[PDB]
Design a protein around this ligand. Structure first.
Ligand SMILES: *C(=O)[C@@H](C(C)C)[C@H]1[C@H](NS(C)(=O)=O)CCN1C(=O)/C=C/CN1CCCCC1
Length: 240
């Protein structure tokens, strides 16, 4: 997250760190949202690789013991069937991960609430992106979880020529684009938390940014629109 602030450790308990095995260690690669004690929602682009993954819940600092973490392996991965790795702009950037064990819930570990199917936010709706992604374009990952306020940019504005044009589809949510704040590499797969009727819900799964950089004016961060996938998510959890 570029231009973020450190999140309080109990503000976003559904946020998880998705990591892969690298040598004798684990490397953070993406964010994700805990949706069931044994299921995590992330981006397809985070797991369409030949790696061994684990999820860390109750994670605040990737490099220090927080004393609240639960480390769990990923048992099964279900990527959206229309996903195409070399065509993120087509959409379908979503995947569900079934965990090897069910995690224990507490103030640092909670299920993320998803919007009702079809829900679209009004332009400039208040949301926060969270994650450990780069803190600057071509920079380095954050050690502590960061958050940045990114109000939404509706489909009509987002798909206009000075914004993203037709690269953005109606199955996506755009947010930010102020040139200072944004998601960045390593934030992909994580949540876009939006406040609606007093409660935060995860309306987006971080998917992509501009080729020019993370925080680019009029190139808001783009997310898979969760509300376009409620039936898909329900179908997967039920058949697995
Ligand atoms: C996730 O971290 C994203 C954004 C949110 C930073 C990032 C990831 N790239 S990487 C180097 O961490 O593997 C996954 C894809 N991604 C992108 O920004 C992809 C952008 C690609 N463009 C191609 C042109 C059409 C729009 C998307």
């Amino acid at each position: 997250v570029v231009g973020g602030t450190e999140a309080q450790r109990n503000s976003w308990p559904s946020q998880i760190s998705l990591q892969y095995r690298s040598g004798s260690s684990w490397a953070h690669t993406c964010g994700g949202t805990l949706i069931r004690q044994n299921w995590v929602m992330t981006a397809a682009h985070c797991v369409d690789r030949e790696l061994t993954f684990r999820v860390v819940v109750g994670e605040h600092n990737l490099n220090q013991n927080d004393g609240t973490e639960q480390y769990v392996g990923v048992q099964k991965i279900v990527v959206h069937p229309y996903w195409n790795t070399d065509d993120v702009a087509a959409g379908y950037d979503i995947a569900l991960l079934r965990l090897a064990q069910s995690v224990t819930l507490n103030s640092y570990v909670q299920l993320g609430v998803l919007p009702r199917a079809g829900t679209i936010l009004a332009n400039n709706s208040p949301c926060y992106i969270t994650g450990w992604g780069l803190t600057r374009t071509n920079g380095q990952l954050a050690q502590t979880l960061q958050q940045a306020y990114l109000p939404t940019v509706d489909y009509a504005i987002c798909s206009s020529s000075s914004y993203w044009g037709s690269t953005v589809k109606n199955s996506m949510v755009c947010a930010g684009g102020d040139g200072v704040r944004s998601g960045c590499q390593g934030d992909s797969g994580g949540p876009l938390h939006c406040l609606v009727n007093g409660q935060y819900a995860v309306h987006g799964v971080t998917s992509f940014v501009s080729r020019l950089g993370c925080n680019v004016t009029r190139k808001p961060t783009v997310f898979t629109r969760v509300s376009a996938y409620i039936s898909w998510i329900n179908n997967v959890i039920a058949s697995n």
